A paper describes a structure:
In this article, we studied five members of the [name] lectin family from [name] subsp. laumondii TT01 ([name], PLL2, PLL3, PLL4, PLL5, collectively referred to as PLLs). All studied lectins belong to the seven-bladed β-propeller structural family. Each blade makes a W-motif composed of four antiparallel beta-strands (β1-β4) connected by β-turns and loops. The saccharide binding sites are located between the adjacent blades and are uniquely organized in two separate circles around the monomer.
In this study, we used [name] originating directly from [name] subsp. laumondii TT01 (formerly P. luminescens subsp. laumondii TT01) to ensure all five studied lectins originate from the same bacterial strain. The two versions of [name] differ in 12 mutated amino acids – five of them affecting three potential binding sites. Additionally, the protein used in this study lacks the His-tag on the C-terminus and is seven residues longer on the N-terminus. [name] is a homotetramer stabilized by up to four disulphide bridges. The electron density for the Cys267-Cys267 bridge shows one possible orientation of cysteines with sulphur atoms in 2.35 Å distance, corresponding to disulphide bond formation. Cys234 can adopt two different conformations, which can be explained as a mixture of oxidised and reduced states. Therefore Cys234-Cys234 bridge might not be formed in all [name] molecules. Our data from mass spectrometry (intact mass analysis) suggest the formation of both disulphide bridges, as [name] behaved as a covalent tetramer during this experiment. The [name] chain A blade W1 interacts with chain B blade W3, whereas in the case of PLL2, PLL4 and PLL5, chain A blade W1 interacts with chain B blade W5. For [name] and PLL4, only hydrophobic site activity has been shown, as αMeFuc occupied only H sites, and structure in complex with other potential ligands is not available.
Author numbering:
A (entry chain A), B (entry chain A), C (entry chain A), D (entry chain A): 26 to 376
Write the structure that this text describes.
């Protein structure tokens, strides 16, 4: 059906020096951010810092090709705004600047392989729209342009190994649909094509170490399902497979430094669950639980030494995190620790 | 729930010279058999030949370690009987000889790695029972002995790569359960352990080319699901995965000569469907259909040159087959051809 | 150059019940054999038993498709003779029967996938010759027939996964050459083709679990080298790779029950060395040594529970063996133990 | 022995927008550079542009974590100097700035995973020395510090998947030696350890998509050899393997967008040769030749759409290039095309 599983409560990015930095919306409806002081999971965090301005979406973040983080959000009148570091690895930001338009989803940002950011969002006519940097890592943007379709989830964009951006979204029939650049980093796009099934979360996309994209989503029966490219184009995919175990949030996927995939999701008992590929391309482990009730989907990242780190909303409405203790992929994990200073709200547009 | 998907209509074996031979039950309630005259899929078949005697199960067949085929069936009073070739690759059979007992499933036969046949069946108390050759390829059998449990499907047995027989069956809770030799070819067995889930077919088991067993079955939502060993013991398995596509028979699995798995099943439109692993351990292709409505599950085998061949019941109640045209695993396939002479009935005990 | 590294001192086969049985030539110039009483590496051995008759080659053995072992040897006048078990798993043998011809290598036997044994040997004109069973597992043989070429090593034959026999031998230029059935189990053969390089041992061939043959041999610099099929035909192969470490015998290859390859050879210090694939298709481990000076190449086999076992000639001129302690492929190993009763000689024709 | 195979004639880097840029030494002994105008292999090139100043090494280049290219070279008095783009993707450079020291190899630069450049070179005492940025992408450098050893080749540095820099060099015994950070991006280093063998080129290092480093080098018999990590630490490696085919330059390695490795080297006939992995981890293809005699080792890079591109010195002493025609990894290749404007010299210090 048409449910959208609970989103992650923050977006995360690595800075130019790989320090992790998180962005979320507080009770004042402003975006706040916090960062590691050094790029290791046991680092202190700087503390929560506000960007002035009321917002009405989850903030999206990406690192420019010159190392500067840039954040995208929706304003009260549904326009898109963006902020950026004015130099890499520095806490001096531009404050919010306008890209106009009217959007009806969270904004989603991807980096073209020619160094230009590109933003995707659902529009007021429910089509997919996009806007892009016209020169790499420069505040020079295109006009808005439509890619059509009818969307019923937030979009997810990811670059193929050959540099073609590909965008995924739920359609009017609740199936997963996708559309792609047919030449890398150009405004030449395919038609929409359906990958069928029914999904009940936003899609989540990752690249494998054989150059094939893989998509994860919750399905109609509330279990995790996934599908992958089988060749070196966007057209031909595997069948869908679902894994046993009811999940109650969007999934978050990560490729560990051994090249194998891991997926995290809130489980049926409202704790964080993890599953991983036990061999090349499969199969998948039984889900393993971490202690503690959580109140959002996980958001996952990797530190400068490869260690996986996970962020979640706690029952105190604050952000908590845990991580791998060693770069070994069968390393033990820490238990939830607080990143205190503010509490957060779920501003995701499509919920 | 407690449905058991339609079974295959014949069992099949390779003779000592790899000629295929099929066994099924005709309208007279007798077992009839037919064989290739030469071990190639385009060979003529000898014609259907009767074993005298009324039976009340699907016949099971296995090749002894001396090359002689041996068939196991249930009689009207629920006892087990067996017949054998008196020399490899010859049509001179022993006629039915008694192993007594009382069984309430189809008999299932496996070959120990010390060359002794072993037969498994559900008993009159719904437990798993077994009986075995006490010397390899010899008509000298043990007494019947119980392995306990409560079974609600026919059993499926397969040997691990380390020589330990492992038996799979649906239990009273409709989950997949299993039990195993703890030392190869000995009467030292584990306790029953559940692999969970719910299955609505008999389980079907195959060995991968990394030494790991994999089990296929139809699930509660009538799609194919599968699970595999993740290590080099019987205890630790993957999570279950289900593949999209409703199936309407038991599946049949085969390892092609490139070492990759293929599964065949009757689909939702009552045609034969096939899916295959597109890479090592996964993922799986979309199902592909063959033309023609079929009236049983497929039974699958491989010829002396590796070519896959599939048998099914047609709407005329006769046996049909098709095969790969070349030893290439992306070879085209023939269309259904008749193996005429008799018509067949489904004598499977648990249906 | 034209050296041929020291051969194994026995051939070995698994009986129908998987008991290991070894064949070698004693100081009386007769073939003697010995066998496990039960199919486990720690089993007692029956004791050494003689086949009457003087021989002038290493004996070759293969199991027929009806489970009966059959041995091939050369007589004083260079004719081929064979002996067989008259029933599987029994010590009642036919005594030596004539196949005539004149051969100038050790005989090499392979089993076609239609159940017919086929023997290859160098002839008096240095070409490759062959002779075969005309019906599976029957004492009915063809006439001798030439496959041409010029051979400078003993031949090695192995069946492809699609049932085509392929034969390998060193040629007049000291390179590895090969020739193959172009249809499985038929007398339709390719032309000779060179795989180039230079080898200084007989070639040793094994099948991988993706259906590709791989060939091992000592090279000109006395290190192990190997080459593999890259597709699903006999024509297209990889480049050669050599592994560091000087070896002083023929290698012996085995596929462990995890599907990975291991190679054993006498090393530069005259001890047994082993190397194994640390991942799928590679790379290879550093050689690991077993304690004890040895006086032949290893001969390797697998027991009914998958455990690898190795046989060698000791400095006392008797046969010794060691094995894996568990079915785990990183299991510890036993130390050399004697299979006493006779001493052995190297009767290999081409040395 | 102590030969060092011919080096590449340029270094290459991707700009922040992925445009390729090459650096080499002309007949005036100055560094000149040239770049793609757009990041595609069929792009025009801007033309050759000079950095004023006489140099006495091959120039090394790396992209900072803020996207700015930075070049390292030796001056007449053997000191290290560096130049950088003052903004990403712009042709406004700092001109040469001093890092002093005295070096006796080409400088080699690597990027730590905390965004700090680090430079390695042989010193006047033949030990390995290093110097580093003390803050990411900032002109603030450490003092020089020794890592000891005795070097007889230029060093090669590469980051492990867990963020630890590892450095490779030939030692006084002509073997490959290595040393590594024991904590990522810290000045805590291991002792030197030997990987044995004998190499007759500089080592060339790449990371696989399972997180394992692999090293290529020419060996004593002038063939390509390679060795790889087998676990997730720096300590345990495979045996060495050599591939047939005599090579007459350093090799250049690249990971294609399907995750498989390819190696290029000048061959025995003075043409460019290529070999590639035909499966996961192996084996390797026979070498394939491109038409045309070449006068240096290849330098290899990848374009924004994944396409591989190769640079070489021609017999006219100018730079030529060729590339893949499509993002397919079995795509055809172009033939050599000139990047004209200057001629080049081999300034590599250790030759
Ligand atoms: C620029 O156009 C405005 O913004 C787009 C993103 C769409 O919502 C469109 O319907 C709207 O008119
Ligand atoms: C082009 O197709 C349109 O857009 C897709 C994204 C889907 O919503 C589909 O149902 C709709 O008709
Ligand atoms: C030998 O025992 C008989 O046969 C077994 C297979 C069981 O059905 C048992 O209950 C029955 O009494
Ligand atoms: C040992 O457990 C028993 O047998 C199994 C095969 C299952 O039927 C289970 O429900 C039952 O209690
Ligand atoms: C049957 O022919 C005889 O045996 C063959 C195996 C060859 O040695 C041939 O030269 C010889 O004449
Ligand atoms: C067909 O070629 C012949 O036989 C091969 C086996 C090689 O000995 C070769 O040198 C010889 O000319
Ligand atoms: C800073 O030290 C100088 O430069 C180093 C790189 C070494 O060559 C050293 O011997 C020399 O004295
Ligand atoms: C620490 O060891 C020293 O440095 C290495 C790099 C080698 O040159 C070795 O021969 C030398 O003794």
């Amino acid at each position: 059906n048409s449910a959208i599983a609970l989103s992650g409560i923050v977006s995360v990015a690595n800075n130019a020096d790989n320090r992790l930095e998180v962005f979320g919306v507080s009770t004042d409806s402003a975006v706040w951010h916090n960062w590691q002081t050094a790029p290791l999971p046991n680092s202190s965090w700087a503390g929560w810092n506000k960007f002035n301005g009321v917002v009405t979406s989850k903030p999206a973040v990406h690192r420019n090709s010159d190392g500067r983080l840039e954040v995208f959000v929706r304003s009260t009148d549904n326009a898109l705004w963006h902020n950026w570091q004015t130099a890499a690895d520095t806490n001096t930001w531009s404050s919010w600047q306008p890209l106009y338009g009217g959007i009806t989803s969270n904004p989603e940002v991807c980096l073209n392989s020619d160094g230009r950011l590109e933003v995707f969002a659902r529009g007021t006519d429910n089509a997919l729209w996009h806007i892009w940097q016209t020169a790499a890592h420069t505040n020079s943007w295109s006009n808005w342009k439509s890619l059509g379709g009818t969307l019923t989830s937030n979009p997810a964009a990811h670059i193929n190994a050959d540099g073609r951006i590909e965008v995924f979204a739920r359609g009017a029939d609740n199936a997963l649909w996708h559309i792609w650049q047919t030449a890398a980093h150009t405004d030449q796009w395919s038609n929409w094509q359906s990958l069928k099934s029914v999904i009940t979360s936003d899609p989540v996309v990752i690249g494998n170490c054989d150059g094939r994209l893989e998509v994860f989503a919750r399905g109609a029966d509330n279990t995790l399902r996934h599908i992958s490219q089988i060749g070196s184009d966007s057209v031909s995919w595997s069948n869908w497979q679902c894994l046993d175990g009811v999940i109650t949030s969007a999934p978050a996927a990560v490729k560990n430094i051994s090249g194998r995939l891991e997926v995290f999701a809130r489980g049926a008992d409202n704790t964080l669950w993890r599953t991983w590929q036990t061999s090349q391309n499969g199969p998948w482990s039984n889900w393993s639980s971490f202690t503690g009730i959580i109140a959002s989907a996980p958001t996952v990242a990797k530190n400068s030494d490869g260690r996986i780190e996970v962020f979640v909303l706690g029952l105190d409405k604050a952000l908590w995190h845990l991580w791998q203790t060693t770069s070994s992929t069968t390393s033990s994990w820490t238990t939830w620790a607080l990143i205190g200073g503010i509490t957060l709200i779920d501003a995701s547009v499509i919920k």
